[PDB]
Protein backbone atom coordinates (compact mmCIF):
# COMPACT_ATOMS: atom_id res chain seq x y z
CA UNK A 1 0.00 0.00 0.00
CA UNK A 2 1.40 3.33 1.16
CA UNK A 3 5.16 3.72 1.69
CA UNK A 4 7.61 6.06 3.43
CA UNK A 5 11.26 7.06 3.60
CA UNK A 6 12.71 8.42 6.84
CA UNK A 7 16.12 9.57 8.03
CA UNK A 8 16.81 9.65 11.78
CA UNK A 9 19.65 11.67 13.30
CA UNK A 10 20.88 11.52 16.89
CA UNK A 11 23.55 13.84 18.28
CA UNK A 12 24.65 13.52 21.91
CA UNK A 13 27.19 15.80 23.60
CA UNK A 14 29.80 13.79 25.52
CA UNK A 15 31.34 15.77 28.45
CA UNK A 16 34.00 13.11 29.16
CA UNK A 17 35.06 12.56 25.53
CA UNK A 18 36.83 14.64 22.85
CA UNK A 19 33.90 14.52 20.43
CA UNK A 20 30.09 14.29 20.59
CA UNK A 21 28.35 11.16 19.24
CA UNK A 22 26.43 11.25 15.95
CA UNK A 23 24.30 8.46 14.46
CA UNK A 24 22.31 8.62 11.23
CA UNK A 25 19.99 5.88 9.95
CA UNK A 26 17.87 5.55 6.82
CA UNK A 27 14.59 3.63 6.74
CA UNK A 28 12.24 2.63 3.95
CA UNK A 29 8.99 1.71 5.65
CA UNK A 30 10.21 -0.54 8.49
CA UNK A 31 13.47 -1.72 6.86
CA UNK A 32 16.70 0.13 7.65
CA UNK A 33 18.96 0.55 4.61
CA UNK A 34 21.80 2.93 5.53
CA UNK A 35 23.80 3.89 8.62
CA UNK A 36 26.50 6.31 9.71
CA UNK A 37 28.28 6.32 13.07
CA UNK A 38 30.84 9.02 13.94
CA UNK A 39 32.64 6.58 16.26
CA UNK A 40 32.98 3.76 13.69
CA UNK A 41 36.26 3.08 11.85
CA UNK A 42 35.07 3.54 8.25
CA UNK A 43 33.81 7.16 8.48
CA UNK A 44 31.45 6.41 5.58
CA UNK A 45 27.76 5.79 4.95
CA UNK A 46 27.25 2.02 5.25
CA UNK A 47 24.72 -0.35 3.58
CA UNK A 48 22.22 -2.15 5.87
CA UNK A 49 19.85 -3.64 3.30
CA UNK A 50 20.59 -6.05 0.41
CA UNK A 51 18.88 -3.83 -2.19
CA UNK A 52 20.90 -0.66 -1.52
CA UNK A 53 24.07 -2.62 -2.46
CA UNK A 54 23.33 -2.24 -6.18
CA UNK A 55 23.97 1.53 -5.98
CA UNK A 56 27.35 2.60 -7.40
CA UNK A 57 30.47 4.38 -6.00
CA UNK A 58 29.07 7.88 -6.68
CA UNK A 59 26.01 7.21 -4.49
CA UNK A 60 28.19 6.11 -1.56
CA UNK A 61 30.61 9.06 -1.95
CA UNK A 62 27.59 11.38 -2.23
CA UNK A 63 25.84 10.00 0.86
CA UNK A 64 29.14 10.01 2.80
CA UNK A 65 29.96 13.70 2.14
CA UNK A 66 26.34 14.66 2.85
CA UNK A 67 26.00 12.73 6.14
CA UNK A 68 29.36 14.12 7.32
CA UNK A 69 28.01 17.64 6.69
CA UNK A 70 24.89 16.66 8.69
CA UNK A 71 27.24 15.40 11.43
CA UNK A 72 29.21 18.67 11.56
CA UNK A 73 26.02 20.76 11.49
CA UNK A 74 24.42 18.83 14.38
CA UNK A 75 27.70 19.06 16.31
CA UNK A 76 27.51 22.87 16.08
CA UNK A 77 23.77 22.69 16.90
CA UNK A 78 24.59 21.21 20.33
CA UNK A 79 26.72 24.28 21.15
CA UNK A 80 24.07 26.63 19.76
CA UNK A 81 21.24 25.23 21.92
CA UNK A 82 23.52 25.20 24.98
CA UNK A 83 23.85 28.97 24.45
CA UNK A 84 20.13 29.46 23.71
CA UNK A 85 19.04 27.91 27.03
CA UNK A 86 22.08 29.23 28.97
CA UNK A 87 23.25 25.73 29.95
CA UNK A 88 26.75 24.76 31.13
CA UNK A 89 29.21 22.43 29.37
CA UNK A 90 29.16 19.91 32.25
CA UNK A 91 25.95 18.14 31.19
CA UNK A 92 25.08 15.82 28.31
CA UNK A 93 22.35 16.89 25.88
CA UNK A 94 20.58 15.26 22.92
CA UNK A 95 19.62 16.73 19.56
CA UNK A 96 17.29 14.56 17.48
CA UNK A 97 16.24 15.17 13.89
CA UNK A 98 13.85 13.36 11.57
CA UNK A 99 12.87 14.06 7.98
CA UNK A 100 11.23 12.21 5.10
CA UNK A 101 8.23 11.72 2.86
CA UNK A 102 5.14 9.52 2.56
CA UNK A 103 3.61 8.20 -0.66
CA UNK A 104 0.17 6.66 -1.25
CA UNK A 105 -0.42 3.28 -2.91
CA UNK A 106 -0.22 5.11 -6.26
CA UNK A 107 3.31 6.16 -5.15
CA UNK A 108 2.52 9.89 -5.20
CA UNK A 109 3.49 12.35 -2.45
CA UNK A 110 1.15 12.50 0.56
CA UNK A 111 3.05 14.06 3.48
CA UNK A 112 6.50 15.43 4.28
CA UNK A 113 8.26 15.74 7.63
CA UNK A 114 11.13 17.82 9.07
CA UNK A 115 11.39 18.12 12.85
CA UNK A 116 13.74 18.50 15.82
CA UNK A 117 13.83 17.63 19.50
CA UNK A 118 16.19 18.89 22.18
CA UNK A 119 16.37 16.62 25.26
CA UNK A 120 13.29 14.65 24.16
CA UNK A 121 11.12 17.73 23.66
CA UNK A 122 9.66 19.15 20.44
CA UNK A 123 11.83 22.03 19.27
CA UNK A 124 10.85 22.94 15.70
CA UNK A 125 8.70 21.21 13.07
CA UNK A 126 7.58 21.79 9.49
CA UNK A 127 3.77 21.87 9.15
CA UNK A 128 1.80 19.74 6.64
CA UNK A 129 1.33 22.74 4.29
CA UNK A 130 5.16 22.56 3.97
CA UNK A 131 5.52 26.35 4.19
CA UNK A 132 5.22 26.93 7.93
CA UNK A 133 7.22 26.27 11.12
CA UNK A 134 6.00 25.23 14.55
CA UNK A 135 8.46 26.71 17.04
CA UNK A 136 7.77 25.65 20.64
CA UNK A 137 9.63 28.35 22.60
CA UNK A 138 11.64 31.58 22.22
CA UNK A 139 14.84 29.65 21.43
CA UNK A 140 13.16 27.91 18.48
CA UNK A 141 11.95 31.32 17.28
CA UNK A 142 15.61 32.27 16.76
CA UNK A 143 16.04 29.15 14.59
CA UNK A 144 12.81 29.96 12.74
CA UNK A 145 14.02 33.48 11.88
CA UNK A 146 17.31 32.11 10.50
CA UNK A 147 15.43 29.66 8.27
CA UNK A 148 12.82 32.13 6.96
CA UNK A 149 15.67 34.42 5.87
CA UNK A 150 17.32 31.54 3.98
CA UNK A 151 13.96 30.30 2.60
CA UNK A 152 14.59 26.82 4.06
CA UNK A 153 10.95 25.62 3.83
CA UNK A 154 10.79 26.32 0.08
CA UNK A 155 14.03 24.37 -0.45
CA UNK A 156 12.81 21.55 1.79
CA UNK A 157 9.55 21.31 -0.17
CA UNK A 158 11.68 20.75 -3.28
CA UNK A 159 13.43 17.82 -1.58
CA UNK A 160 10.37 16.26 0.11
CA UNK A 161 8.13 16.46 -2.98
CA UNK A 162 10.93 15.84 -5.49
CA UNK A 163 14.18 14.10 -4.53
CA UNK A 164 12.69 12.29 -1.49
CA UNK A 165 9.78 10.80 -3.46
CA UNK A 166 11.94 9.96 -6.52
CA UNK A 167 14.56 8.08 -4.49
CA UNK A 168 11.85 6.32 -2.44
CA UNK A 169 10.28 4.94 -5.66
CA UNK A 170 13.74 3.91 -6.89
CA UNK A 171 14.40 1.97 -3.65
CA UNK A 172 10.91 0.41 -3.70
CA UNK A 173 11.70 -1.02 -7.15
CA UNK A 174 15.27 -2.21 -6.47
CA UNK A 175 14.07 -3.97 -3.31
CA UNK A 176 10.76 -5.15 -4.80
CA UNK A 177 10.94 -8.65 -3.26
CA UNK A 178 11.53 -7.22 0.24
CA UNK A 179 9.74 -3.85 0.34
CA UNK A 180 6.63 -4.70 -1.70
CA UNK A 181 5.85 -8.03 0.00
CA UNK A 182 3.02 -8.49 2.49
CA UNK A 183 3.25 -11.20 5.17
CA UNK A 184 0.06 -12.16 7.00
CA UNK A 185 0.29 -12.70 10.78
CA UNK A 186 0.43 -16.24 12.10
CA UNK A 187 -1.95 -16.08 15.07
CA UNK A 188 -2.65 -18.16 18.18
CA UNK A 189 -3.99 -17.70 21.72
CA UNK A 190 -2.54 -18.79 25.07
CA UNK A 191 -4.16 -19.23 28.49
CA UNK A 192 -2.66 -18.75 31.96
CA UNK A 193 -4.29 -18.93 35.40
CA UNK A 194 -3.06 -15.98 37.47
CA UNK A 195 -5.27 -16.75 40.49
CA UNK A 196 -8.19 -19.04 41.42
CA UNK A 197 -10.69 -16.50 40.03
CA UNK A 198 -8.67 -14.79 37.26
CA UNK A 199 -7.01 -15.90 34.01
CA UNK A 200 -4.81 -14.30 31.34
CA UNK A 201 -5.64 -14.67 27.65
CA UNK A 202 -2.81 -13.65 25.33
CA UNK A 203 -3.43 -13.02 21.63
CA UNK A 204 -0.33 -13.50 19.46
CA UNK A 205 0.59 -12.08 16.06
CA UNK A 206 3.81 -13.49 14.59
CA UNK A 207 5.88 -13.31 11.37
CA UNK A 208 4.04 -10.35 9.82
CA UNK A 209 5.20 -7.57 7.47
CA UNK A 210 4.87 -4.60 7.47
CA UNK A 211 4.94 -3.62 11.17
CA UNK A 212 1.49 -1.96 11.11
CA UNK A 213 -1.09 -4.09 12.95
CA UNK A 214 -4.19 -3.65 15.14
CA UNK A 215 -4.82 -6.15 17.95
CA UNK A 216 -8.00 -5.43 19.91
CA UNK A 217 -9.90 -7.33 22.59
CA UNK A 218 -13.68 -7.44 22.80
CA UNK A 219 -15.99 -8.53 25.62
CA UNK A 220 -19.40 -9.61 24.25
CA UNK A 221 -18.64 -8.01 20.86
CA UNK A 222 -17.71 -4.77 22.63
CA UNK A 223 -14.29 -3.07 22.61
CA UNK A 224 -12.22 -3.71 25.74
CA UNK A 225 -9.15 -1.68 26.72
CA UNK A 226 -10.05 -1.34 30.43
CA UNK A 227 -7.88 -4.37 31.32
CA UNK A 228 -5.80 -4.80 28.14
CA UNK A 229 -2.00 -5.08 28.12
CA UNK A 230 -0.38 -4.23 24.78
CA UNK A 231 3.34 -4.62 24.07
CA UNK A 232 5.16 -2.50 21.48
CA UNK A 233 5.53 -4.13 18.05
CA UNK A 234 8.94 -5.81 18.11
CA UNK A 235 11.27 -7.00 15.34
CA UNK A 236 11.88 -10.74 15.03
CA UNK A 237 15.28 -9.99 13.47
CA UNK A 238 14.58 -11.64 10.11
CA UNK A 239 12.57 -8.76 8.59
CA UNK A 240 9.27 -9.76 10.19
CA UNK A 241 7.55 -8.35 13.28
CA UNK A 242 5.80 -9.61 16.41
CA UNK A 243 3.13 -8.30 18.80
CA UNK A 244 0.78 -9.61 21.49
CA UNK A 245 -2.21 -8.36 23.47
CA UNK A 246 -3.46 -9.80 26.77
CA UNK A 247 -6.54 -9.44 28.98
CA UNK A 248 -7.10 -10.55 32.58
CA UNK A 249 -10.48 -12.31 32.56
CA UNK A 250 -12.60 -13.94 35.30
CA UNK A 251 -12.16 -17.73 35.33
CA UNK A 252 -14.95 -19.54 33.47
CA UNK A 253 -15.55 -16.47 31.29
CA UNK A 254 -12.75 -17.06 28.75
CA UNK A 255 -15.14 -17.68 25.82
CA UNK A 256 -16.88 -14.30 26.28
CA UNK A 257 -13.72 -12.61 24.94
CA UNK A 258 -12.55 -12.25 21.34
CA UNK A 259 -9.28 -11.00 19.83
CA UNK A 260 -9.42 -9.12 16.53
CA UNK A 261 -6.41 -9.03 14.20
CA UNK A 262 -6.20 -6.35 11.50
CA UNK A 263 -3.38 -6.48 8.93
CA UNK A 264 -2.72 -5.60 5.26
CA UNK A 265 -1.66 -9.14 4.25
CA UNK A 266 -4.92 -10.44 5.69
CA UNK A 267 -7.81 -10.80 3.18
CA UNK A 268 -10.33 -10.51 6.03
CA UNK A 269 -9.89 -9.47 9.69
CA UNK A 270 -9.49 -12.49 11.99
CA UNK A 271 -11.58 -13.12 15.09
CA UNK A 272 -10.06 -15.45 17.69
CA UNK A 273 -11.84 -17.08 20.64
CA UNK A 274 -10.37 -19.38 23.30
CA UNK A 275 -11.29 -23.05 22.81
CA UNK B 1 19.19 9.80 -0.66
CA UNK B 2 19.94 12.52 1.91
CA UNK B 3 19.14 16.21 1.54
CA UNK B 4 22.06 18.26 0.16
CA UNK B 5 21.27 21.47 2.04
CA UNK B 6 22.38 21.68 5.67
CA UNK B 7 20.48 24.26 7.79
CA UNK B 8 21.63 25.15 11.33
CA UNK B 9 19.68 25.73 14.55
Amino acid sequence: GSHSMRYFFTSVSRPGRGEPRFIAVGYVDDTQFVRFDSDAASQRMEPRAPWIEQEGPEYWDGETRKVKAHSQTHRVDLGTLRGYYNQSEAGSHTVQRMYGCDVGSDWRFLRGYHQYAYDGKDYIALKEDLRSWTAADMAAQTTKHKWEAAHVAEQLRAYLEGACVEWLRRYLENGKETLQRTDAPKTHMTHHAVSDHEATLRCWALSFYPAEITLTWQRDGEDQTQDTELVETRPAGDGTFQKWAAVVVPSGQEQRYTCHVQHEGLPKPLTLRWE
Amino acid sequence: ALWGFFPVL
Partner: T-cell receptor
Amino acid sequence: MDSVTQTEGLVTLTEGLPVMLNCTYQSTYSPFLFWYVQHLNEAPKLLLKSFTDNKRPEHQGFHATLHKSSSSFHLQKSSAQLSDSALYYCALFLASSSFSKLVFGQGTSLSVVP
Amino acid sequence: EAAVTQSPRSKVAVTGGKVTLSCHQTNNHDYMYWYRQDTGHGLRLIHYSYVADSTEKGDIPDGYKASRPSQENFSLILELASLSQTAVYFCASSDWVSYEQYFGPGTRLTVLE
Protein backbone atom coordinates in the same frame (compact mmCIF):
# COMPACT_ATOMS: atom_id res chain seq x y z
CA MET C 1 21.29 17.46 -17.15
CA ASP C 2 21.42 20.43 -14.76
CA SER C 3 22.74 23.45 -16.66
CA VAL C 4 22.49 27.20 -17.36
CA THR C 5 22.40 29.05 -20.71
CA GLN C 6 23.10 32.81 -20.90
CA THR C 7 23.12 35.42 -23.67
CA GLU C 8 26.32 34.86 -25.66
CA GLY C 9 29.12 37.43 -25.71
CA LEU C 10 28.81 41.21 -25.35
CA VAL C 11 25.58 43.16 -24.95
CA THR C 12 25.99 46.84 -25.83
CA LEU C 13 23.30 49.25 -24.65
CA THR C 14 22.73 53.02 -24.56
CA GLU C 15 22.24 54.68 -21.16
CA GLY C 16 18.57 55.20 -20.29
CA LEU C 17 17.37 52.08 -22.11
CA PRO C 18 16.05 48.84 -20.46
CA VAL C 19 18.37 45.93 -19.65
CA MET C 20 17.39 42.43 -20.83
CA LEU C 21 19.88 39.61 -20.19
CA ASN C 22 18.61 36.11 -20.91
CA CYS C 23 18.97 33.08 -18.66
CA THR C 24 17.42 29.66 -19.27
CA TYR C 25 18.09 26.43 -17.38
CA GLN C 26 17.50 22.70 -17.11
CA SER C 27 16.62 21.51 -13.61
CA THR C 28 15.75 18.02 -12.37
CA TYR C 29 13.99 19.38 -9.27
CA SER C 30 12.24 22.61 -8.21
CA PRO C 31 14.68 25.36 -9.40
CA PHE C 32 16.52 28.01 -7.38
CA LEU C 33 18.47 30.58 -9.40
CA PHE C 34 20.75 33.50 -8.61
CA TRP C 35 22.35 36.44 -10.41
CA TYR C 36 25.97 37.30 -9.67
CA VAL C 37 27.81 40.43 -10.79
CA GLN C 38 31.50 41.12 -11.36
CA HIS C 39 32.68 44.66 -12.08
CA LEU C 40 36.07 45.19 -13.76
CA ASN C 41 39.01 44.32 -11.47
CA GLU C 42 36.59 43.29 -8.71
CA ALA C 43 35.27 40.10 -7.09
CA PRO C 44 31.97 38.50 -8.15
CA LYS C 45 29.22 39.34 -5.62
CA LEU C 46 25.58 38.22 -5.22
CA LEU C 47 23.05 40.50 -6.90
CA LEU C 48 19.62 38.83 -6.59
CA LYS C 49 17.70 35.61 -5.78
CA SER C 50 14.81 33.69 -7.39
CA PHE C 51 12.97 33.37 -4.04
CA THR C 52 9.55 34.86 -3.22
CA ASP C 53 6.66 33.32 -3.38
CA ASN C 54 5.24 33.95 -6.92
CA LYS C 55 8.22 34.91 -9.23
CA ARG C 56 9.45 38.49 -8.66
CA PRO C 57 12.32 40.60 -7.19
CA GLU C 58 15.55 41.24 -5.24
CA HIS C 59 18.73 43.65 -5.56
CA GLN C 60 18.97 47.46 -6.90
CA GLY C 61 17.22 48.78 -10.01
CA PHE C 62 17.79 45.22 -11.23
CA HIS C 63 15.05 42.61 -10.92
CA ALA C 64 14.42 39.11 -12.28
CA THR C 65 11.25 37.02 -12.53
CA LEU C 66 11.35 33.22 -12.53
CA HIS C 67 9.09 31.56 -15.08
CA LYS C 68 9.28 27.86 -14.22
CA SER C 69 7.04 26.88 -17.17
CA SER C 70 9.57 27.98 -19.81
CA SER C 71 12.54 27.80 -17.40
CA SER C 72 13.46 31.50 -17.58
CA PHE C 73 15.25 33.83 -15.15
CA HIS C 74 16.11 36.90 -17.22
CA LEU C 75 17.84 39.91 -15.66
CA GLN C 76 15.92 43.16 -16.16
CA LYS C 77 16.22 46.86 -15.35
CA SER C 78 14.12 49.88 -16.40
CA SER C 79 16.91 52.37 -17.15
CA ALA C 80 20.55 51.38 -17.67
CA GLN C 81 23.32 53.59 -16.28
CA LEU C 82 27.05 53.67 -17.16
CA SER C 83 28.00 52.15 -13.79
CA ASP C 84 25.95 49.04 -14.71
CA SER C 85 28.72 48.04 -17.14
CA ALA C 86 29.82 44.69 -15.69
CA LEU C 87 29.92 40.91 -16.15
CA TYR C 88 26.73 39.14 -15.09
CA TYR C 89 26.48 35.49 -14.03
CA CYS C 90 23.25 33.52 -13.88
CA ALA C 91 23.60 30.58 -11.46
CA LEU C 92 21.73 27.35 -10.64
CA PHE C 93 21.78 26.09 -7.03
CA LEU C 94 21.76 22.28 -6.81
CA ALA C 95 21.15 21.00 -3.26
CA SER C 96 18.23 18.52 -3.43
CA SER C 97 19.87 15.09 -3.90
CA SER C 98 23.47 16.32 -4.14
CA PHE C 99 25.83 18.47 -2.06
CA SER C 100 25.07 22.21 -2.21
CA LYS C 101 26.72 23.75 -5.28
CA LEU C 102 26.19 26.76 -7.53
CA VAL C 103 26.34 26.02 -11.26
CA PHE C 104 27.30 29.26 -13.05
CA GLY C 105 26.67 30.06 -16.71
CA GLN C 106 29.30 31.55 -19.03
CA GLY C 107 28.34 35.09 -18.01
CA THR C 108 27.14 37.97 -20.19
CA SER C 109 29.25 41.13 -20.47
CA LEU C 110 27.16 44.30 -20.37
CA SER C 111 28.50 47.49 -21.93
CA VAL C 112 26.48 50.62 -21.22
CA VAL C 113 27.44 53.44 -23.60
CA PRO C 114 26.76 57.20 -23.17
CA GLU D 1 31.85 42.59 6.58
CA ALA D 2 32.51 39.09 5.21
CA ALA D 3 35.87 39.24 3.41
CA VAL D 4 38.07 36.77 1.55
CA THR D 5 41.74 37.34 0.68
CA GLN D 6 43.93 35.52 -1.88
CA SER D 7 47.70 35.18 -2.40
CA PRO D 8 49.45 35.71 -4.69
CA ARG D 9 47.52 38.19 -6.84
CA SER D 10 49.72 37.33 -9.84
CA LYS D 11 51.86 34.33 -10.79
CA VAL D 12 53.99 33.43 -13.81
CA ALA D 13 54.81 29.72 -13.93
CA VAL D 14 56.68 27.23 -16.14
CA THR D 15 55.13 24.03 -17.54
CA GLY D 16 55.89 21.13 -15.19
CA GLY D 17 56.42 23.43 -12.20
CA LYS D 18 54.63 23.57 -8.84
CA VAL D 19 52.10 26.33 -8.11
CA THR D 20 50.42 26.92 -4.73
CA LEU D 21 47.51 29.36 -4.52
CA SER D 22 46.52 30.43 -1.01
CA CYS D 23 43.21 31.66 0.38
CA HIS D 24 42.42 33.20 3.77
CA GLN D 25 39.08 33.95 5.40
CA THR D 26 38.06 34.97 8.95
CA ASN D 27 34.26 35.02 8.54
CA ASN D 28 33.85 31.84 10.60
CA HIS D 29 32.70 30.05 7.43
CA ASP D 30 32.97 26.27 7.22
CA TYR D 31 32.46 26.13 3.44
CA MET D 32 35.20 27.19 1.00
CA TYR D 33 35.49 26.90 -2.80
CA TRP D 34 37.96 27.31 -5.68
CA TYR D 35 36.74 28.52 -9.08
CA ARG D 36 38.52 29.28 -12.34
CA GLN D 37 37.48 31.95 -14.85
CA ASP D 38 38.44 31.74 -18.53
CA THR D 39 38.92 34.82 -20.77
CA GLY D 40 36.44 36.88 -18.70
CA HIS D 41 33.82 34.12 -18.88
CA GLY D 42 32.68 31.07 -16.91
CA LEU D 43 33.10 30.15 -13.26
CA ARG D 44 33.87 26.44 -12.90
CA LEU D 45 34.28 24.70 -9.53
CA ILE D 46 37.58 22.85 -9.07
CA HIS D 47 37.54 21.77 -5.41
CA TYR D 48 35.49 22.57 -2.31
CA SER D 49 35.57 22.00 1.46
CA TYR D 50 32.92 21.95 4.22
CA VAL D 51 35.28 21.19 7.13
CA ALA D 52 38.96 21.55 8.11
CA ASP D 53 41.26 18.64 7.10
CA SER D 54 38.89 17.41 4.36
CA THR D 55 38.47 18.35 0.68
CA GLU D 56 35.95 17.40 -2.03
CA LYS D 57 36.30 17.27 -5.83
CA GLY D 58 34.42 19.86 -7.88
CA ASP D 59 33.31 19.84 -11.51
CA ILE D 60 36.84 20.01 -12.96
CA PRO D 61 39.38 18.53 -10.47
CA ASP D 62 41.98 17.06 -12.91
CA GLY D 63 45.51 18.45 -12.47
CA TYR D 64 44.54 20.23 -9.25
CA LYS D 65 44.80 19.20 -5.61
CA ALA D 66 43.43 21.08 -2.61
CA SER D 67 44.28 21.36 1.09
CA ARG D 68 42.25 22.74 4.01
CA PRO D 69 44.71 22.85 6.97
CA SER D 70 42.29 24.94 9.08
CA GLN D 71 38.87 26.65 8.92
CA GLU D 72 40.58 29.86 7.77
CA ASN D 73 42.88 28.51 5.03
CA PHE D 74 42.24 26.77 1.69
CA SER D 75 45.10 25.98 -0.70
CA LEU D 76 44.96 25.15 -4.41
CA ILE D 77 47.89 23.03 -5.61
CA LEU D 78 49.12 22.44 -9.16
CA GLU D 79 51.83 19.75 -9.01
CA LEU D 80 52.76 19.82 -12.70
CA ALA D 81 51.54 23.06 -14.29
CA SER D 82 50.22 22.96 -17.86
CA LEU D 83 49.34 25.61 -20.47
CA SER D 84 45.65 24.72 -20.04
CA GLN D 85 45.79 26.01 -16.44
CA THR D 86 46.30 29.65 -17.52
CA ALA D 87 43.30 31.46 -16.00
CA VAL D 88 41.95 33.68 -13.24
CA TYR D 89 41.35 31.75 -10.00
CA PHE D 90 38.75 32.84 -7.45
CA CYS D 91 38.44 31.61 -3.89
CA ALA D 92 35.04 31.81 -2.20
CA SER D 93 33.52 31.18 1.24
CA SER D 94 30.04 30.71 2.69
CA ASP D 95 28.21 29.49 5.77
CA TRP D 96 25.30 27.00 5.59
CA VAL D 97 23.46 29.48 3.32
CA SER D 98 25.78 28.28 0.55
CA TYR D 99 24.09 30.19 -2.26
CA GLU D 100 25.47 33.39 -0.74
CA GLN D 101 29.13 32.89 -1.58
CA TYR D 102 31.73 35.57 -0.89
CA PHE D 103 34.57 35.77 -3.39
CA GLY D 104 38.25 36.69 -3.06
CA PRO D 105 39.94 39.30 -5.29
CA GLY D 106 41.23 36.70 -7.78
CA THR D 107 44.59 35.30 -8.90
CA ARG D 108 45.90 35.81 -12.43
CA LEU D 109 48.02 32.81 -13.36
CA THR D 110 49.82 32.34 -16.67
CA VAL D 111 51.71 29.12 -17.42
CA LEU D 112 54.45 29.25 -20.07
CA GLU D 113 56.64 26.68 -21.87
